Design a protein that fits this description.
The structure is cut from a larger assembly and holds one copy of chain A, two copies of chain B and one copy of chain C.
Chain A (H helix, E strand, L loop, with lengths): L1 H39 L1
Chain B lengths: L1 H8 L7 H9 L3 H7 L1
Chain C lengths: L2 H20 L9 H20 L4 H19 L6 H15 L3 H21 L10 H25 L3 H21 L4 H9 L3
Classes of the chains: A mainly alpha, B mainly alpha, C mainly alpha.
Subcellular location (chain C): Nucleus, Nuclear pore complex
Protein name (chain C): Nucleoporin NUP188
Organism (chain C): Xenopus laevis
């Protein structure tokens, strides 16, 4: 049933894409806050 | 609730539209709510 | 009266293209032009078949759907606006359908649209009927979600409901990620106590 | 349909989730023209 394989693949692809975008945003938040701490510091 | 719903649903010349609406207002659950 | 004949012949073309994509080199199925022709043709076929209002068309389009899904998954790198409008009308017809038979078709059309948006990052302005698109997505989400809610509540068919749920969730997530201003999202959430 | 209640048919097909573009056009247009009739400025107000 190549269909189910395809669909689960696309779904997990979306999930990984969102998790990665999330981690990237989180790291951006951390680093921006870090530069902010450095300036105010 | 079931009873008042049944009275609201009874095809009868005595239960006018107004009493139907009132019996409704006085009236596995989620599909029941969507149906209503 | 030619129904069973065309049905079997479609089963043949299906199995043929499947065994082809699994070993494209042996089939010499390297041609991305041919790959795209096949994908577009199977899509439009699923469309025209799913457009007829009045059971055969259902099963036929379902086979075509499984095919198109596996095919898009394998040929993604070879794989848009007109496709968007078409899948829009298709999901529209899938909505005007009785629910108990249109589930798999909705899931297929949804994954298709997801592939259509993931194929190229687009802003809401380039999405035709984006308002109507999100509207329908919201309607389907609301209905199916309330349904899954009642289904989980009566449990005081487990995985498929949650699958469709998470699916629509990520779908709307991406749709909102396309609308950074939320103004349309605002009108939506104002229309629906989601 | 028999009494040609355009607004009513619009509400009905809305409750039925049926989508027919030109039919909806006709429903709105029928509402407009029939109202413009039933008050034969007063027409546009109707």
């Amino acid at each position: 049933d190549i269909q189910g394989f395809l669909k689960n693949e696309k779904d997990n692809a979306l999930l990984s894409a969102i998790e990665e975008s999330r981690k990237r945003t989180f790291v951006m938040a951390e680093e921006y806050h870090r530069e902010s701490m450095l300036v105010e510091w | 609730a079931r009873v008042v719903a049944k009275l609201a649903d009874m095809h009868s010349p005595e239960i006018s539209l107004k009493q139907r609406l009132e019996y409704i207002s006085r009236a596995a659950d989620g599909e029941f709510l969507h149906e209503l | 009266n030619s129904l069973t004949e065309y049905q079997q012949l479609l089963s043949a073309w299906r199995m043929f293209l499947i065994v082809a994509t699994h070993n494209a080199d042996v089939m010499h199925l390297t041609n991305p032009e041919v790959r795209q022709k096949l994908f577009k043709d199977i899509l439009g076929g699923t469309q025209a078949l799913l457009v007829v209002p009045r059971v055969a068309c259902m099963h036929l389009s379902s086979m075509l759907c499984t095919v198109m899904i596996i095919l898009l998954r394998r040929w993604k790198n070879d794989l848009p606006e007109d496709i968007l409008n078409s899948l829009t009308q298709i999901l529209e017809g899938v909505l005007q359908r009785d629910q108990q038979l249109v589930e798999k078709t909705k899931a297929q059309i949804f994954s298709a649209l997801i592939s259509v948006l993931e194929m190229k990052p687009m802003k809401a302005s380039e999405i035709p009927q984006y308002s109507q698109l999100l509207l329908n997505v919201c309607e389907t989400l609301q209905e199916e979600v309330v349904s899954l809610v009642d289904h989980t509540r009566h449990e005081v068919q487990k995985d498929q409901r949650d699958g469709v749920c998470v699916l629509g969730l990520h779908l709307a997530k991406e749709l909102c990620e396309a609308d950074e201003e939320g103004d349309q999202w605002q009108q939506v959430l104002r229309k629906l106590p989601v | 349909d028999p009494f040609r209640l355009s607004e009513c048919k619009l509400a009905i097909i809305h409750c039925a989730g049926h989508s027919d573009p030109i039919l909806v056009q006709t429903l709105w247009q029928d509402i407009i023209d029939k109202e413009l009739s039933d008050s034969m400025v007063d027409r546009m107000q109707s």
